From a paper:
C-terminal binding proteins (CtBPs) are cotranscriptional factors that play key roles in cell fate. CtBP1 and CtBP2 regulate cellular processes through binding transcription factors and recruiting chromatin remodeling enzymes such as histone deacetylases, methyl transferases, and demethylases to targeted promoters. Although assembly of CtBP has primarily been considered in terms of dimers, there is accumulating evidence that NAD(H) binding triggers the assembly of two CtBP dimers to form tetrameric dimers of dimers. Our crystal structures of CtBP1 with AMP reveal participation of the adenosine phosphate in the tetrameric interface, pinpointing its central role in NAD(H)-linked assembly.
Five residues with different amino acid identity between CtBP1 and CtBP2 have atoms within 5 Å of NADH. For each of the five, we mutated the CtBP1 residue to that in CtBP2 to determine the contribution of each to the distinct AMP responses. One particularly interesting mutant, V185T, enhanced tetramerization in the presence of AMP. The basis for the enhanced assembly of CtBP1 V185T became clear from the crystal structure, which revealed a well-ordered water molecule bridging the Thr hydroxyl and a phosphate on AMP in CtBP-V185T. This ordered water molecule stabilizes a cluster of water molecules in the vicinity of bound AMP, which apparently stabilizes bound AMP over that in wild-type CtBP1. Our results also highlighted another important sequence variation, Thr 191 in CtBP2, which is occupied by the isosteric, but nonpolar, Val 185 in the homologous position in CtBP1. It is likely that the hydrogen bond between Thr 191 and the nicotinamide phosphate of NAD(H) contributes to the stabilization of coenzyme binding in CtBP2 that is absent in CtBP1.
Author numbering:
A (entry chain A), B (entry chain A): 26 to 357
The structure:
């Protein structure tokens, strides 16, 4: 028979089937954890596809007896211990290009929703507020600010971050970015301003947007300490990873007014709920259910790419034939 | 005594007082119609300031016995019969520059809210929807589309329209515009594509945004007939004037799905209410309470400019000293 490939945290395999039909047997688990995956998959699965709703620890990885390649249908892979996976001889890949501009457009929409209060204005109308006079327009829309001259601070000037910077300049934003891993001069190529420390970024930014990956060194990057370094009444946007922000510190900052508003597509604990979590009673909050990446074309694009990567690993040499393996250094 | 200047449809005069203290007596009416204005104002008012919530017909204008200048605190003046005002010897001015970029940023936010469904996703979370799996993310966010390659059609390429076009290009939009009054070649200067007829604009546009003024020739520009010329599942955005769209025709188009969604900051009858009007049961609708213009700096900027214009008219020669009079042709 063919090698077994399993969709860990999902059920739909329609897009991947035409690409893997003659290369592997495809099954799905629809499991939120390794405890929900049948022994057959853990015993015989040679490849694996997964999104962001299941975590793979070293303990989880050790339970796979034949897994040779994990392909994350998406850009982020913080939910996988790529180091231990490489130790166990498991290559890990991702799909980084499918949702770059989708996430940037969602970020700009979140930024504009804070500066223009469009979402809150709409919600006020749905709740029955009557805005007849100009005085009432100013009151209901109180907080909407002029964008030109404002400083947008970008943390992580990667593919998505660069797309955010290019769009932000079209609105008159003055864009700063902090990225301690980029080579010297990337700010000159894109006509941006760069700072060397996170504190400098937070000190000068009227609006801070996160576009870095979650790694072992930037967990709770926005914490009670760094939150005190942000400008009075600053904006916070996060379409990256919920693990980057201490919602406990963010919640208090919103209540006290030190942060005028926050737009979040990712949270420390998902799915997100307005009735649970540290943000239970936090005001001036816009939240989306981790959908900044999604478009019909982006969804199909990343699923087909991931399928081909699984194919290359089963019919080629690992990791030589892999196109987007993220743990070649750790791979044994 | 000094000449009397009256704030027709408002109450707050704090910003204008320091500019007019030694030039005119300032009073406010806070009236939605001429029927609520005291006889003293109609008899002695030499100047008048007004926003968009009161209409001035020829019948209304004839009731002023000493009015010599009307200054609209804003860009649009469709709520005034400038032709009859000029006939009666009444100069009419506006403030066109204060909210150009504010309105453009609100427009882009409305456009992004349609393509990214950020507002609807937020509202779904506030209503309690649980989005745990990727399949549920696609379902709840169903309709979010990739922006690059889409065609944004602009109706009216004025100051705001041009600002919208410049921003729209940063997202990968291919921008078309229809403006039968612009001189030949304005499309080359700004690197845009131009069409000659409204039908051509609607035929090619995936998203149609209105940025023209309401005049005697474009009332119900979007009607049951022209709505049938728009692409299947097109987007409609209106931060211009509610009188440009036939909400009856728009309502049915949304229900039948011929229009995938509409974002409206202006309506045929304001204040807008989700329980009254032709849009009572229309789906896929985003509405803001005529606040696309508002920012703290823009509000102060236009009020101070309008005050100086009233000053120039009282201490100078009409309409020679006026900076933004819009009816010099009709002025006797
Ligand atoms: N702690 C951090 N602070 C700022 N930027 C970071 C941090 N960690 C990673 N990055 C950057 O974030 C960017 C993300 O890349 P991309 O995968 O293209 O979105 C890269 O340029 C990284 O160097
Ligand atoms: N019916 C119409 N269709 C398209 N454009 C129009 C129409 N009426 C006026 N405009 C244009 O809309 C623009 C508005 O100018 P502005 O005052 O700068 O926003 C001007 O360029 C007008 O020529
Ligand atoms: Ca501020
Ligand atoms: Ca379409
Ligand atoms: Cl995902
Ligand atoms: Cl402001
Ligand atoms: Cl899909
Ligand atoms: Cl106004
Ligand atoms: Cl799409
Ligand atoms: Cl004001």
């Amino acid at each position: 028979h063919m090698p077994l490939v399993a969709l860990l945290d999902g059920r739909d395999c329609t897009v991947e089937m035409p690409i893997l039909k003659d290369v592997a047997t495809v099954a799905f688990c629809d499991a939120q954890s390794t405890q929900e995956i049948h022994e057959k998959v853990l015993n015989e699965a040679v490849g694996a596809l997964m999104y962001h709703t299941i975590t793979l620890t070293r303990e989880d990885l050790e339970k796979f007896k034949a897994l040779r390649i994990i392909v994350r249908i998406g850009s982020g892979f913080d939910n996988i211990d790529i180091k231990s996976a490489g130790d166990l001889g498991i290559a890990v890949c991702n799909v980084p290009a499918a949702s770059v501009e989708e996430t940037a457009d969602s970020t700009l929409c979140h930024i504009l929703n804070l500066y223009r209060r469009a979402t809150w204005l709409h919600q006020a109308l749905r709740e029955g507020t009557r805005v007849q006079s100009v005085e009432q327009i100013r009151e209901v829309a109180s907080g909407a600010a002029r964008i030109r001259g404002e400083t947008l601070g970008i943390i992580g000037l990667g593919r998505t971050g660069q797309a955010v910077a290019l769009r932000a300049k079209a609105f008159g934003f003055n864009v700063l970015f902090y990225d301690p891993y980029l080579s010297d001069g990337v700010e000159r190529a894109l006509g941006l301003q760069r700072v060397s420390t996170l504190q400098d970024l937070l000190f000068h930014s009227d609006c801070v947007t996160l576009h870095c990956g979650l790694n072992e060194h930037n967990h709770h990057l926005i914490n009670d300490f760094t939150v005190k370094q942000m400008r009075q009444g600053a904006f916070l946007v996060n379409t990256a990873r919920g693990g980057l922000v201490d919602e406990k510190a963010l919640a208090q900052a919103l209540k006290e007014g030190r942060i005028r508003g926050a737009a979040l597509d990712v949270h420390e604990s998902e799915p997100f709920s307005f009735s649970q979590g540290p943000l239970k009673d936090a005001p001036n909050l816009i939240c989306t259910p981790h959908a900044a990446w999604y478009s019909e074309q982006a969804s199909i694009e990343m699923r087909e790419e991931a399928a081909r990567e699984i194919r290359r690993a089963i019919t080629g040499r690992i990791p030589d034939s892999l196109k987007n393996c993220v743990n070649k250094d750790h791979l044994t």
